[PDB]
Each structure stands twice: as structure tokens, then as C-alpha cells.
């Protein structure tokens, strides 16, 4: 399994080392947001060997670590246009050189606006309902500006109908994403004290109580 | 450097139908060096085939791959609900290896009379900054549909926002949520707020109800 | 510069006969002695005897005299022992090395070296055990998991290169004694790419290999 590291937010004109814990290059793979993934470059920790694509060559370096076994880039010199996810994939060597197993991936964002936290907003479960099957209730995220936050029910335990939207520019660079879960447990409720987000940037969390109102 | 063709796109089909996806190149590639890859909505792309014929080390023979020279077509012999995903083409033939546009298979099942539920604002950002309402339209099938928000019996402009999530692996539904966020003040006379929404489901506008 | 490649562990018995087999890697013996060198386990080296393929010649310590016959084969250029005659008292990692002449007889280059082991008892398999790597551990950084190698009886046995810890082994109630290996991975989840934990005995010649799974 390939671990990667977390959503650098950088300034027009900075540096992000991207880890990917790491006979197996590393490809490292770009994907602008909403777009196609291209190929930036390769390594292989047991020889050393670098090679990068020729548009990217003067401000990538890729290196890796064979001891600690641990591959990084150094994407220096990087303009706005650069802010897209990036991915770590295991090679095959000459003729099968076929992306195997992938990273999580890495989001850098790259535009000097600022970091907001994730202000998380009132949940107030609907009263008069469905009869039982569905109850709806929803612990919303607003007003934070650098994407990710995850945000999971019961720290990760709820995972039957947590269902989480995209966010969505509003007036400001800000973004916004609501997260909303389904409870066959009416009245009370077993676990309700729930609701855990976490911020890359910011590295705040925030865990609120529902209750039925 | 090989731009390349891939398939039309987005697909409607029923489950039990065979699927083609195909992936023209406009520079002559070798008869056997492109892999086609599958990502799932959010996560990282798994590899489907290697080398045009082969297929990756546990993934089920309904994903066949063929072509030659310069057209690469990858054919689903039956599509379950577990394979709405995009698909790329990879020519790791020529250098630098230059990946597909991409093509989208959305699996074509049931139309999904949606549950509509609204969260009138509460007393935490009703304490600071801007408010917001929210009209949650869960489970929905397929992606047409449109929400206006009504507010106190009174139509309302473009100051919405609707963001809707991808179709689920298992459930292949569309769930939405449309937004109106407010001055935090203008919650005076405004007894009721509601999103009518209109659907391929269910025969009338559904439309709600705040009050409190 | 050549390295030198010597045997593997052999286990004799009280009376027995050991041919330890240094190797010239190169091809080359040229005007350059081995000199052999004891070192019984916890303690400080010895000189044993001298050879030079080119001339055949060959000495030896007056203890070690009457037991012990060193010879060398120039044309396929391999060196040995044979200590014929041996007590328990022998058990010891026995080294090779390259003279250098008259008054320059310092040790340059040795050889990896080769731990005879001379009692009657036995000989018994490396048993490898239960790895189980802790669920609950660091958040991260180290996820320790190690495949661990318990009765076994005449040592060498290899085992599991940034965090394979390895400890001596150490005697139990029988002759037998065991040593544990432990690794540290980054990939905490599935931690999976350790499923070769390799292990070799010489004496045995029984190669182990198994695959951690977090529980």
C-alpha cells in the first residue's frame, strides 16, 4: 500500500515536498482539478535514476531515500497553474512500465489568498420525518477557504449512508461541503456524539452533538 | 508525445449490456503497448488492462481488452452497478507517456422518486456571520433535477448554489443539496422557506414547509 | 583489493575433523599468505598458522600442533584447514587473513568468517513464531512488527535493511537458544510488504518464509 502526505496550500513563487512513503520506480502523475492525468516523472531508489517529463524540467526534483525507504519531489519554482492532486505509483521497469499500485494522492493548492478554519454550522435534525427508516440529520461545514476536510460520523465508525457533497466556491475563494448521515434511531438515539472533521491546513477539529429538534 | 481520440463519453447504459469504449491514436503506436485504467468518483486510479490484451493481477474477465496499431478498444461484456467510473487510456508506448482523455460509464437502472427534506438554520451561525438554509434531496435517480427556493410564499432569484453528489458504488443514486445562504439579519417576517423540486420521480413539484 | 569468502557453520562433534575453506575472489593468490585466527565466543583473538600458496610453505602455534593441517590449492587458488582432532574446548568463529611477508605480517583483509560448534547433541530446525504486529501503536511513524525464531540448536540462522533490529541469541533451559527479528514500517494499514522474512540455517539448510498481517 502506497501512504502519501497532505494538501500543502503554497504561495505563487514557493516549494512543496510531496512524500509518498515509498525493483520498483515511483511515477509520480499530476491531475488538474476536473482534468486528465499527465506524467511528471519517474525514480528508482535502487539505482538512483531520475528522469522528468520535458515541460517540468529546471523546477522538479525527485528523490528518494532507499534506506528509510521514502521518495519525495521538490516541485520548486511553481506557478498558480500548478494547483492540482498528485498522485505516486509503482512502476515495472523497461517494456512494462504500467502504473500498478497508486498513492491516496496530495492536493496542493497554490494561490496566496489566505488559511480559514473550518467553521462547522448548527446539524438540527428535521422533527416530523420519515416513520422510522430514514431520520435525517446533518452536521454541516461552512466557511473554510483550503480544501481537504474530511469529514466522518462516529471517528470513522458510521460509514452506511454518510453521504458527503463537493464543495462549492461562494462569494469569497472560500469554500463550503455538508455532510449528512441516516439514523434508524428515532427518538434518543444510541451514538449522537459524533461528528469529527479534519482540517490539512489548519489542523483544527471540531466535534458536535446532535439533538432532535 | 501521441494526442489520442478516446470514446463519446458519457454512456447510459442498462446493467447486462456489453460496453465499448474505444481509443483512436493520431500517431502510429505499437500493436501491444496501452493500458486502460478505471478510477472510482474520488479515489486513486486502479489498473484495468496492460498491454491492450492482458488484465491486472485480480480483475474480473468481463473487462476485456483488445485493438491494434492504432485504435484500442476496451469492451465490458456485462456492467454491474460497481463500475460507474471514469476510464483512461495510457499509451506508454511513445514518450513522454501520455494518458486518455478519459471516458465516463454511468450504469443505467432506476429513476428514483427523491426524498426531500429541508434544515431550517439554528441558533449557532443564527449567533454570527451569515446563516445559510439547506434543502437535502436524498436518493435520487438520475441527475435531472431542479430546486427553487420559495421563500414565504415568494419566488425566489439566482442566489442558490446546488451541489449534487456522484452516484454511490452499491446504490447508483444521485442525492443533491441546495443551499441558500442569507443576511444573518433577514429572518423577520419570512415565516416559511422551501425548495420545489422537479423530478422524472414523482408526478408534482414537491415543495415544503419551515414555519417554527 | 580482494575479498575474501570463507564456509559455513559446521557443527562437529567432540573428535571430529572441520576443512573451514577460505576462497581468494579474484582468482588471485599472489605473493600473500592466509593466516588463520581463532576467537572462541566472548573473547579476544588468537594466531593459529600461515600459508603461502606460492611456495607451499606452512606454520603453525606450538598448542595447535600435531592437530591442525592448513594447505591451499595455488592453481584453483582455495585455501583450508582440516583440524583433525578436536576437542569441545574448539567451539570458536575461526577467521582468515592476507599476510603480507617478513616484518610486515599485520592482518590486512579478512574473511567473513565461519563459527564451528563441536559438542554431541544435536541439530534442530528454526521453528519461526507468530509475528503480530500491535493494533494501537505510534500514529505513523513506526508500526513495529517483527517475525520472531525460537527453538533452533546450532547457530548461524539469518533472518529478515533501515530497522530490521536483530538480537543474540541467548540459551534457554535445553541447549537450544533463540533470537528475534523486528522491522519497522511506515505503511501502518495492511502493513504487508515484509511477507518474505527469510530466514536460513546453515546446519538445517530449512529456509522459512511467512507474510505479517495487522491484528
Known amino acids: 500500500?502506497?501512504?502519501?502526505?497532505?494538501?500543502?496550500?503554497?504561495?505563487?513563487?514557493?516549494?512543496?515536498?510531496?512524500?509518498?512513503?515509498?525493483?520498483?520506480?515511483?511515477?509520480?502523475?499530476?491531475?488538474?482539478?476536473?482534468?486528465?492525468?499527465?506524467?511528471?516523472?519517474?525514480?528508482?531508489?535502487?539505482?538512483?535514476?531520475?528522469?522528468?517529463?520535458?515541460?517540468?524540467?529546471?523546477?522538479?526534483?525527485?528523490?528518494?531515500?532507499?534506506?528509510?525507504?521514502?521518495?519525495?519531489?521538490?516541485?520548486?519554482?511553481?506557478?498558480?497553474?500548478?494547483?492540482?492532486?498528485?498522485?505516486?505509483?509503482?512502476?515495472?521497469?523497461?517494456?512494462?512500465?504500467?502504473?500498478?499500485?497508486?498513492?491516496?494522492?496530495?492536493?496542493?493548492?497554490?494561490?496566496?489568498?489566505?488559511?480559514?478554519?473550518?467553521?462547522?454550522?448548527?446539524?438540527?435534525?428535521?422533527?416530523?420525518?420519515?416513520?422510522?427508516?430514514?431520520?435525517?440529520?446533518?452536521?454541516?461545514?461552512?466557511?473554510?477557504?483550503?480544501?481537504?476536510?474530511?469529514?466522518?460520523?462516529?471517528?470513522?465508525?458510521?460509514?452506511?449512508?454518510?453521504?458527503?457533497?463537493?464543495?462549492?466556491?461562494?462569494?469569497?475563494?472560500?469554500?463550503?461541503?455538508?455532510?449528512?448521515?441516516?439514523?434508524?434511531?428515532?427518538?434518543?438515539?444510541?451514538?449522537?456524539?459524533?461528528?469529527?472533521?479534519?482540517?490539512?491546513?489548519?489542523?483544527?477539529?471540531?466535534?458536535?452533538?446532535?439533538?432532535?429538534? | 508525445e501521441i494526442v489520442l481520440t478516446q470514446s463519446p463519453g458519457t454512456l447510459s447504459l442498462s446493467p447486462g449490456e456489453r460496453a465499448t469504449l474505444s481509443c483512436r491514436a493520431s500517431q502510429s503506436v505499437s500493436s501491444s503497448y496501452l493500458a486502460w485504467y478505471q478510477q472510482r468518483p474520488g479515489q486513486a486510479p486502479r489498473l484495468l488492462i496492460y498491454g491492450a490484451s492482458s488484465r491486472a493481477t485480480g480483475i474480473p474477465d468481463r473487462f476485456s481488452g483488445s485493438g491494434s496499431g492504432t485504435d484500442f478498444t476496451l469492451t465490458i461484456g456485462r456492467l454491474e452497478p460497481e463500475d460507474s467510473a471514469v476510464y483512461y487510456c495510457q499509451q506508454y508506448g511513445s514518450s513522454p507517456w501520455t494518458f486518455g482523455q478519459g471516458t465516463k460509464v454511468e450504469i443505467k437502472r432506476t429513476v428514483a422518486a427523491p426524498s426531500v427534506f429541508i434544515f431550517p438554520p439554528s441558533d449557532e451561525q443564527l449567533k454570527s456571520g451569515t446563516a445559510s438554509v439547506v434543502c437535502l434531496l436524498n436518493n435520487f435517480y438520475p441527475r435531472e433535477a431542479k430546486v427553487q427556493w420559495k421563500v414565504d410564499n415568494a419566488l425566489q432569484s439566482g442566489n442558490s448554489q446546488e451541489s449534487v453528489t456522484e452516484q454511490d458504488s452499491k446504490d447508483s443514486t444521485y442525492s443533491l443539496s441546495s443551499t441558500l445562504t442569507l443576511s444573518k439579519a433577514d429572518y423577520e417576517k419570512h415565516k416559511v422557506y422551501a425548495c420545489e423540486v422537479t423530478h422524472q420521480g414523482l408526478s408534482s413539484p414537491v415543495t415544503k414547509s419551515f414555519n417554527r | 583489493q580482494v575479498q575474501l569468502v570463507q564456509s559455513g557453520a559446521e557443527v562437529k562433534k567432540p573428535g571430529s575433523s572441520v576443512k573451514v575453506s577460505c576462497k581468494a575472489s579474484?582468482?588471485?593468490?599472489?605473493?600473500?599468505?592466509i593466516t588463520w585466527v581463532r576467537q572462541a565466543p566472548g573473547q579476544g583473538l588468537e594466531w593459529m598458522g600461515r600459508?603461502?600458496?606460492?611456495?607451499?610453505?606452512?606454520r603453525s602455534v606450538q598448542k595447535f600442533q600435531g592437530r591442525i593441517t592448513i594447505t591451499a590449492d595455488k592453481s584453483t587458488s582455495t585455501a583450508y584447514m582440516d583440524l583433525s582432532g578436536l576437542t569441545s574446548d574448539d567451539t570458536a568463529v575461526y577467521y582468515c587473513?592476507?599476510?603480507?611477508?617478513?616484518?610486515?605480517?599485520?592482518?590486512?583483509?579478512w574473511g567473513q568468517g565461519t563459527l564451528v560448534t563441536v559438542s554431541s547433541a544435536s541439530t534442530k530446525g528454526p521453528s519461526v513464531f507468530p509475528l503480530a504486529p500491535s493494533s494501537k501503536s505510534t500514529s505513523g511513524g513506526t508500526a513495529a512488527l517483527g517475525c520472531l525464531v525460537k527453538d533452533y540448536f546450532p547457530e548461524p540462522v539469518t533472518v529478515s535493511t533501515s530497522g530490521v533490529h536483530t538480537f543474540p541469541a541467548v540459551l534457554q533451559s535445553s541447549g537450544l537458544y533463540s533470537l528475534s527479528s523486528v522491522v519497522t514500517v511506515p505503511s501502518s494499514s495492511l502493513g504487508t510488504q515484509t511477507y518474505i522474512c527469510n530466514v536460513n540455517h546453515k546446519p538445517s539448510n530449512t529456509k522459512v518464509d511467512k507474510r505479517v498481517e495487522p491484528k
Open positions: 579474484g582468482g588471485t593468490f599472489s605473493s600473500y599468505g
Open positions: 587473513a592476507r599476510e603480507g611477508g617478513s616484518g610486515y605480517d599485520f592482518f590486512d583483509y
Open positions: 600459508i603461502i600458496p606460492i611456495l607451499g610453505i606452512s
